[PDB]
């Protein structure tokens, strides 16, 4: 038999303390013991009907309904009643913002004679709460006032009429704040401090990941697609992709020079001791509109 469902409201912050009791289910008789029907990540049920925080409540990790929804078995006349409990959980601003810029680290060029207020980069941050209010800031300026960032748009502009120097690195350290989420009476939730690299004139291409990793089983099909690798050109020149092995396994793999897709060019057999269980490869992105080239590591482990 079924008891009236218990429906109740809380902020995720009301569940900010492990083992804190948040409410108790009614007893029908005093002998009654309570057992949760299924282990729950968020709550424990005590034998007397008390409900406690298990893992700290987190609105961001709950599913679409944003509830902790569970059944409880109530044993004792000799009866075994069932009762459902639904805890509606309310969002509080409690998660820090993060940068969504890619690739990382943040990189850019600046033309040698950029007029003042030339837009050079756009900081882009998100924040997990429903209630965010993001502000962008330079925190370390190692450039002598050559750049500023718009507090709201994230746009990074040049200041001053002075020339910029070819192949010189202008470095800024930036961050975003969610000014709807305090840590104290002073400070707000923050991204990490990111280093923004601005080079005068031009610079080599950059990969979308600082290094690449793939794990495949030993029965992987020949010629099948393993992983996709992409580099960006700062002057939108054409990129040609190229691959090579550090030690063991030349020819085991190859890359489409335009797609940047890596395929398995040979059969894998763990019985064949000549074949390593870990491949160290180097992918190279060459600007084949003359000159600039960049490399990255590709590690492929086999199981
Ligand atoms: Ca949270
Ligand atoms: Ca939240
Ligand atoms: Ca936040
Ligand atoms: Zn939003």
From Swiss-Prot:
It is found in: Cell membrane. It comes from the Eukaryota. Residues 1-99, 110-207, 216-303 form the Cadherin domain. In the embryo, the protein first appears in the mesoderm at stage 9 and is present in the myoblasts and muscle fibers by stage 12 and stage 14, respectively. At stage 12 the protein is also located in the axons of the entire CNS, but not in the glial cells. In third instar larvae protein is expressed in the CNS neuropile, photoreceptor axons and precursors of adult muscles. Three calcium ions are usually bound at the interface of each cadherin domain and rigidify the connections, imparting a strong curvature to the full-length ectodomain. Cadherins are calcium-dependent cell adhesion proteins. They preferentially interact with themselves in a homophilic manner in connecting cells; cadherins may thus contribute to the sorting of heterogeneous cell types. May associate with arm neural isoform and participate in the transmission of developmental information. This is Neural-cadherin. The gene is CadN. The chain holds residues 439 to 747 of 3097 of the full protein.
């Amino acid at each position: 038999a079924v008891r009236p469902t218990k429906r109740i409201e809380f902020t995720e912050a009301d569940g900010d303390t492990e083992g804190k009791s948040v409410f108790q289910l009614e007893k029908e008789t005093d002998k009654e013991t309570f057992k949760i029907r299924d282990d729950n990540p968020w709550v424990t049920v005590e034998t007397n009907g008390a409900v406690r925080v298990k893992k700290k409540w987190d609105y961001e990790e709950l599913g679409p309904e944003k509830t902790i929804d569970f059944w409880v078995i109530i044993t004792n006349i000799k009866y075994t009643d069932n009762q459902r409990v639904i805890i509606l959980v309310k969002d509080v601003n409690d998660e820090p913002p993060y940068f969504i810029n890619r690739p990382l680290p943040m990189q850019a060029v600046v033309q040698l004679n950029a007029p003042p207020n030339t837009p050079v980069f756009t900081l882009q941050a998100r924040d997990p709460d429903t209630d965010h209010n993001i502000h962008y800031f330079i925190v370390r300026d190692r450039t002598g006032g050559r750049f500023e960032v718009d507090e709201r748009s994230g746009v990074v502009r040049t200041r001053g009429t002075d020339l910029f120097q070819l192949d010189m690195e202008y470095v800024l350290y930036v961050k975003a704040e969610d000014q709807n989420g305090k840590v104290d009476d002073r400070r707000f939730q923050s991204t990490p401090e990111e280093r923004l690299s601005i080079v005068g004139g031009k610079r080599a291409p950059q990969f979308y990941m600082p290094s690449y990793e793939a794990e495949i089983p030993e029965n992987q099909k020949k010629d099948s697609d393993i992983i996709s690798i992409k580099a960006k050109s700062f002057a939108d020149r054409e990129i040609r992709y190229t691959l090579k092995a550090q030690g063991q396994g030349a020819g085991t793999f190859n890359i489409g020079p335009t797609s940047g897709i890596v395929k398995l060019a040979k059969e894998l057999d763990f019985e064949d001791l000549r074949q390593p269980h870990v491949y160290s490869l180097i992918v190279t992105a060459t600007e084949d509109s003359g000159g600039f080239s960049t490399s990255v590591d590709l590690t492929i482990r086999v199981t």
